[PDB]
Amino acid sequence: ERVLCLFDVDGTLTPARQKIDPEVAAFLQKLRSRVQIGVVGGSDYCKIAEQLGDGDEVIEKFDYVFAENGTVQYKHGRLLSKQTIQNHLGEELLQDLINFCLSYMALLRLPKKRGTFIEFRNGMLNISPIGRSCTLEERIEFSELDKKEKIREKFVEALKTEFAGKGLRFSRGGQISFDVFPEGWDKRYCLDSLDQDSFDTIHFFGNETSPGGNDFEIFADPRTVGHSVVSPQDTVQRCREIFFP
Amino acid sequence: ERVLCLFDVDGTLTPARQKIDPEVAAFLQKLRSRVQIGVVGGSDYCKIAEQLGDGDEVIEKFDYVFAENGTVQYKHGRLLSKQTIQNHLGEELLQDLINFCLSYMALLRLPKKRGTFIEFRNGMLNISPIGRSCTLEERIEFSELDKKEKIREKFVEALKTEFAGKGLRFSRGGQISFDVFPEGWDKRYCLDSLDQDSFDTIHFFGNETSPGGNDFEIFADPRTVGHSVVSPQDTVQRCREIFFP
Ligand SMILES: [Mg+2]
Ligand SMILES: [Mg+2]
Ligand SMILES: [Mg+2]
Ligand SMILES: [Mg+2]
Numbered sequence: 001e002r003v004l005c006l007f008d009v010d011g012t013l014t015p016a017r018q019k020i021d022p023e024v025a026a027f028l029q030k031l032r033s034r035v036q037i038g039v040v041g042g043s044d045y046c047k048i049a050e051q052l053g054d055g056d057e058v059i060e061k062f063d064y065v066f067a068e069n070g071t072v073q074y075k076h077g078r079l080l081s082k083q084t085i086q087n088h089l090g091e092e093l094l095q096d097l098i099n100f101c102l103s104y105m106a107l108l109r110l111p112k113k114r115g116t117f118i119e120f121r122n123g124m125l126n127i128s129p130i131g132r133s134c135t136l137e138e139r140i141e142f143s144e145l146d147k148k149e150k151i152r153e154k155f156v157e158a159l160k161t162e163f164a165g166k167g168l169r170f171s172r173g174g175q176i177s178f179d180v181f182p183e184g185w186d187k188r189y190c191l192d193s194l195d196q197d198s199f200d201t202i203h204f205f206g207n208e209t210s211p212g213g214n215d216f217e218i219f220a221d222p223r224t225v226g227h228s229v230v231s232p233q234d235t236v237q238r239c240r241e242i243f244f245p
Numbered sequence: 246e247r248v249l250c251l252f253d254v255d256g257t258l259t260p261a262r263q264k265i266d267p268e269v270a271a272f273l274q275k276l277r278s279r280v281q282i283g284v285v286g287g288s289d290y291c292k293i294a295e296q297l298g299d300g301d302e303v304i305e306k307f308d309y310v311f312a313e314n315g316t317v318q319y320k321h322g323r324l325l326s327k328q329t330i331q332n333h334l335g336e337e338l339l340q341d342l343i344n345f346c347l348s349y350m351a352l353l354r355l356p357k358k359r360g361t362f363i364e365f366r367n368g369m370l371n372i373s374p375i376g377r378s379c380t381l382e383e384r385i386e387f388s389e390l391d392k393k394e395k396i397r398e399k400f401v402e403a404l405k406t407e408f409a410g411k412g413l414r415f416s417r418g419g420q421i422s423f424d425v426f427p428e429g430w431d432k433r434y435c436l437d438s439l440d441q442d443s444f445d446t447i448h449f450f451g452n453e454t455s456p457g458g459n460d461f462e463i464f465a466d467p468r469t470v471g472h473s474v475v476s477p478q479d480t481v482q483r484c485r486e487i488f489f490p
Contacts, residue, residue: 084379091357098358098376102351106344112336113343115370120360120379131343134329134365 004199005031005239006064006224008187008206008215009041013232014051017174024232025052027239029061034243036199038064040190042171042179042214044121045072068123069181070190080193082122088182093166097125097180100162104155105129111145114138123189124181126173129155133176143175152178171214187218194223201225203242205235249444250276250484251309251469253432253451253460254286258477259296262419269477270297272484274306279488281444283309285435287416287424287459289366290317313368314426315435325438327367333427338411342370342425345407349400350374356390359383368434369426371418374400378421388420397423416459432463439468446470448487450480 007013013028014020028037039058041048045067052058058074059065065074073081086094098118105117114131129151133139146152156170156178167183187206194202204224206215219226229235252258258273259265273282284303286293290312297303303319304310310319318326331339343363350362359376374396378384391397401415401423412428432451439447449469451460464471474480 086357086359086379095355095358098360099351099354102347102362106347106351109344110340112331113340114331115343115363115365116361117347118360118362118376120376125360131363131365134331 002198002200003035004038004064004194004197004202005035006038006040006066006190006194006202006204006218007235008204008208009039009043009048009051011207011231012205012215012229012235013039015232017047018051020052021232024236025061027236031239031243032063035203036063038062038066040064040066040070040187040218042069042123042173042187044068045074064190064194066190068121069185069187070193071123071185073190073193075193084122085120085124085182085185088185097159097163097168100159101125101127101155104158108151110151111141123185124179126177126179127155128173128177130176139176146175187215188221191218191221191223203227205229205238207231247443247445248280249283249309249439249442249447250280251283251285251311251435251439251447251449251463252480253449253453254284254288254293254296256452256476257450257460257474257480258284260477262292263296265297266477269481270306272481276484276488277308280448281308283307283311285309285311285315285432285463287314287368287418287432289313290319309435309439311435313366314430314432315438316368316430318435318438320438329367330365330369330427330430333430342404342408342413345404346370346372346400349403353396355396356386368430369424371422371424372400373418373422375421384421391420432460433466436463436466436468448472450474450483452476 010016013024031037039048039062048067049056049058053061059077063076071083101118108129110130114134116132117128119126130142133142159170169181169183171179173179202224204218205227206219207229208215209219209226209228218224227238229238255261258269276282284293284307293312294301294303298306304322308321316328346363353374355375359379361377362373364371375387378387404415414426414428416424418424447469449463450472451464452474453460454464454471454473463469472483474483
């Protein structure tokens, strides 16, 4: 009867990369009268906060905010966190990765390039092979080129092969980029800390719980009761069925 | 009798990369009763604003704020600006530059690396060969390694040679990085817009007016009355001598 509902963000509580519907927001606070509620996303904290409230309201609206798959953690209004990838991987492997990426991208000759090809985050390296778009027009242009030439896809194939067996994982940063993160640093990462918070049950909700999806591992983990949803309205209905029948 | 005093920031009005002394700030507003006053820096606007006031006060405290050597311009409280390097250089040369940098850095094997090796700004590309430090400790560590191995210095020599005659310039980003910018996009850039604002005299003050220094060109330009200073106290004294004798 100490219960947590933990939600993926994009596609689960909000439209992808966009603001939460106020009616969903309002339900979550109603759900909060029965259970603790938390979010876990691949995005950084700034992005997640932006989608879920104004300023830093998200840490007040939710009992847990797990950004970068849980490598960044807010707990009951306070920053508990955090871990760094360089600490976990070690400098040698990290630099092997980086120099392989640098060398690969140097040989890519595209219509055009921008900057910040490799960004250090807490939970991952975000790799943007064409560079980060400066406008929406460039972002769309880059997306289309990536689809036609399979830029990110082919880069990841080369990376996975080069680092076979060395414990690196690769996932989409949506369009434009992909993340590189240590094995185990998918959404499951947040479960290790949650393990110590004495929940009787942890319900996880996500919209990519199929194999390949960025919710799969946390959905499938024996530490959670898993729920697959297709939309924020689906999520709200499932919560009503389980907690307010 | 329409006069502008235009100041470099770092070392001229403030300690390098640091906040302005309130007593200097106070004098500048007194000087403002006689002349218009402006700043021009290599840094981005956020950095300059941070050194000269709280929030966006700098655009209120100064009649002109020229960031990134004038490629970004605030004029009497409003953003007038701005120009982009990609527009000026063209995509082909830009990508030649970028891929040369990527390829060069890929072959650098250091004690360690971080991220954001190439950052797109308005007035330049900021190149950080070891990556951007995550802490003060890493920043100092990187500075020392750069001094011993001449990392930035040797990278610039290779770059200048490769792009000989093609109109690129290179200058220090302090420690850790160097800027690449188009010929003419040093501090003089801001003079072109100022040319149209009907000043009878434009007095420029800087602390790197010697050849090699990032104030040299604007100091030497026939559009300004040039002044060399060594400290923010030197600057204030010179203004007192010229305007309040
Ligand atoms: Mg999702
Ligand atoms: Mg489960
Ligand atoms: Mg200076
Ligand atoms: Mg002059």
